[PDB]
Design a protein around this ligand. Structure first.
Ligand SMILES: [Mg+2]
Length: 76
């Protein structure tokens, strides 16, 4: 396991403990636990990609102390 950072555009950093084989789905569930944001409303971005729920941290080459951007799904 290692840490990653999840950063909002309000300048807030969420630090998560994760494993390489964790899926984005699993990560969004953690973010829900920390910030109460429903996974269906979370958009995570890394390497300019909108990350897919079924892929893993390793799939995206996310590593120790990598940062992911977190923004909300734009409604309306
Ligand atoms: Mg775990």
């Amino acid at each position: 396991h290692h840490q990653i950072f999840v950063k909002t555009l309000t300048g807030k950093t969420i630090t998560l403990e994760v494993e390489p084989s964790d899926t984005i789905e699993n990560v969004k569930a953690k973010i829900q636990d920390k910030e109460g944001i429903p996974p269906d409303q979370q958009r995570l971005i890394f390497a300019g990609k909108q990350l897919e729920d079924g892929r893993t941290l390793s799939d995206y080459n996310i590593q120790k102390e990598s940062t992911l951007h977190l923004v909300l799904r734009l409604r309306g």
